[PDB]
Design a protein around this ligand. Structure first.
Ligand SMILES: Cc1[nH]c(=O)n(C)c(=O)c1N
Length: 149
């Protein structure tokens, strides 16, 4: 058995949906990310209210790709006034640090049975950017991602 993920109560988990394979590569290389304005606000609130008592996990997926591509932990609050144009589009403003802890393609077919009661019970694989995942579903997603071969 693996009871690792079932045994934790302080952590928050968000879906990250990116249009750009370049931005994913840049994020892995430099351990930084930037969301939209309302996305950044959502993640910043979650990070600051955690007060380092548990992780904020980010489950990354490229829009239309059919799979998740990895997992990162958020590692700073959002700095909203930073260099413009570092991402594939110049519409994203700011920067926060992440730490990629898992880089692996996980097909949507391995996760589409997990549904989000906070998103009309839609499959977790039909989420939009910065969709939050209830902890009990997040544990199941993390276990499937960690065990996929
Ligand atoms: C870096 C970045 N941040 C985002 O919020 N979205 C929605 C993207 O597509 C992307 N490439």
């Amino acid at each position: 058995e693996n009871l690792y993920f079932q045994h934790m109560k302080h952590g928050r988990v968000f879906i990250i949906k990116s249009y750009s394979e370049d931005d994913i590569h840049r994020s892995i290389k430099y351990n930084i990310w930037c969301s939209t304005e309302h996305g950044n606000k959502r993640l910043d609130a979650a990070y600051r209210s955690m007060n380092g008592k548990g992780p904020v996990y980010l489950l990354f997926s490229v829009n239309g790709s059919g799979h998740f591509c990895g997992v990162a932990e958020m590692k700073s609050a959002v700095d909203y006034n930073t260099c413009a144009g570092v991402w594939s589009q110049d519409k994203w403003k700011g920067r926060f640090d992440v730490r990629w802890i898992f880089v692996k393609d996980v097909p949507n077919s391995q996760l589409r049975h997990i549904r989000l009661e906070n998103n009309e019970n839609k499959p977790v694989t039909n989420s939009r950017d910065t969709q939050e995942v209830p902890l009990e579903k997040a544990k199941q997603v993390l276990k499937i991602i960690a065990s996929y071969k």
